[PDB]
């Protein structure tokens, strides 16, 4: 199993302190006052399809964002090698089971406030000793890092080998027929969460393919007329249940393997993701794979924000540096619709209607978020939602390159 990890904390958007309050620290959905393995606790039991959000957690991404900010204040052991306290709260034990008020016996030193501190598990030797019980820290820290590096949307990884899907993985995949993406993400999160796993594992490679397949269907390159290995994702009309994409197996044609190995990093370049479940689900699922196996290679700095330029174990500009692509959902949907009519699944009249429906749907997302931002100004003290500008909803980004990659990926 992977015995070392690296990470990076969040960046204060000009504010002087991490953006959370004690109540946020008090109302986590999991076990009391523990951040680990909690990113899905708020929807383990569900009814209906309506997104879950509340007054002080007003977006589907809000809870996870808060958690990331929260962790940024207490991860000192992986930077300074010691446990510290902030505003009179610290960990119960060196195993970091949960947070608690500081005891009045041996108060640990007060944490010095800073941002974007690089992290290395080797600074804290006890983690190696207690790996069997501290394993979930590995997954969560990696998740936090993968979000901290971006100013606009979480970063995640894609790859497809030259060989066909190995038989062992196919045996596992049939267990996940007809399950929506969100459920799959929750399952993927739990798998890499509880116990340490080897990078070489049937389950790991299974999820890796799942990530690739979903992206291929996302562009519409994969559909019921062109499957990966019989697998593909089925979509509902965006006018209603716009997110209930599920996995299907089919007996039809299969896309041929790529000429060479393909791999890249992906990102959403528009604020839409903060209130769109499928982006969160896809990002987390891919990130879960990278968590257990580590980063295949450094990320290209060229398109990243300022604080992300040249992170020690994360970003670079040398030779073995995988580029990162980013896209906007609206043009992506248009391309997906275009693929469908080209493959003949739909007629052009339907394609025009689908674009109108989706654009209207996306408009509500923007309208909701922009109204929600002013209701929770970042200067208040906590950041339930990430700041943005109105123009960010119109950026096309590298969407053209994205669909080009998928076409080169599944062929």
């Amino acid at each position: 199993a992977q015995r070392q990890f690296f990470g990076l904390t969040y960046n204060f958007y000009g504010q002087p302190a991490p953006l959370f309050d004690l109540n946020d620290l008090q109302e986590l959905a999991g076990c009391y006052a523990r951040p680990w393995t909690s990113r899905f606790s708020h929807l383990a039991i569900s009814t209906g399809s309506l997104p879950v959000w509340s007054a002080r957690y007003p977006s589907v991404a809000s809870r996870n964002i808060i958690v990331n900010t929260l962790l940024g204040a207490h991860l000192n052991p992986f930077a300074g090698g010691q446990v510290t306290s902030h505003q009179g709260i610290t960990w119960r034990d060196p195993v970091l089971s949960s947070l608690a008020p500081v005891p009045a016996i041996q108060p640990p030193p007060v944490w010095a406030v800073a941002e974007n501190v690089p992290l290395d598990s080797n600074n804290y030797p006890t983690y190696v000793l207690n790996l069997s019980s501290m394993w979930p820290i590995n997954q969560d820290v990696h998740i936090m890092t993968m979000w901290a590096l971006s100013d606009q949307g979480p970063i995640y990884h894609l790859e497809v080998p030259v060989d066909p899907m190995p038989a062992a993985t196919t045996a596992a995949l049939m267990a996940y027929i007809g399950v929506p993406i969100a459920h799959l993400a929750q399952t993927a999160y739990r798998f890499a969460g509880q116990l340490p796993q080897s990078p070489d594992s049937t389950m790991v490679s299974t999820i890796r393919w799942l990530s690739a397949i979903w992206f291929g269907s996302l562009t519409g390159r994969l559909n019921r007329s062109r499957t990966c290995n019989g697998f593909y994702f089925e979509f509902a009309k965006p006018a209603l249940n716009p997110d209930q994409a599920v996995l299907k197996w089919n007996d039809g044609a299969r896309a041929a393997p790529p000429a060479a190995a393909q791999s890249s990093y992906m990102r959403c370049i528009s604020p839409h993701w903060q209130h769109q479940i499928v982006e969160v689900a896809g990002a987390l699922m891919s990130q879960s794979v990278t968590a257990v196996t580590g980063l295949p290679a450094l990320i290209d700095e060229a398109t990243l924000p300022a604080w992300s330029q040249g992170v020690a174990n994360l970003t670079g500009n040398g030779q073995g540096v995988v580029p990162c692509l980013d896209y906007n959902p609206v043009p992506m949907a248009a391309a997906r619709h275009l693929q469908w009519r080209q493959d003949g699944l739909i007629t052009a009249a339907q394609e025009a209607q689908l674009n109108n429906d989706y654009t209207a749907y996306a408009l509500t997302i923007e309208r909701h978020l922009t109204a929600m931002l002013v209701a929770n100004p970042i200067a208040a003290g906590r950041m339930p939602i990430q700041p943005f500008n109105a123009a960010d909803f119109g950026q096309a980004g590298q969407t053209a390159a994205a669909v080009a990659l998928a076409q080169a990926m599944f062929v």
């Binding site: 080897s198 049937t202 389950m203």
Partner: protein, 49 residues
């Protein structure tokens, strides 16, 4: 095979001997014994954590 994990077969235990050929094989020299001597221990029982 010490350290591996194997199933129980509580309903009728005689299946236990059949389920995992090779484990605890006598070093006698018989045709089946000679064959079973070539089994690889890592492929007994479950494979994953």
């Amino acid at each position: 095979t010490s350290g591996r994990m194997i199933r129980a077969f509580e309903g009728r235990p005689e299946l236990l001997a059949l389920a995992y050929p090779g484990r605890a094989v006598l070093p006698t020299q018989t045709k089946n014994a000679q064959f079973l001597s070539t089994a690889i221990a890592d492929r007994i029982g479950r494979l994953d954590r």
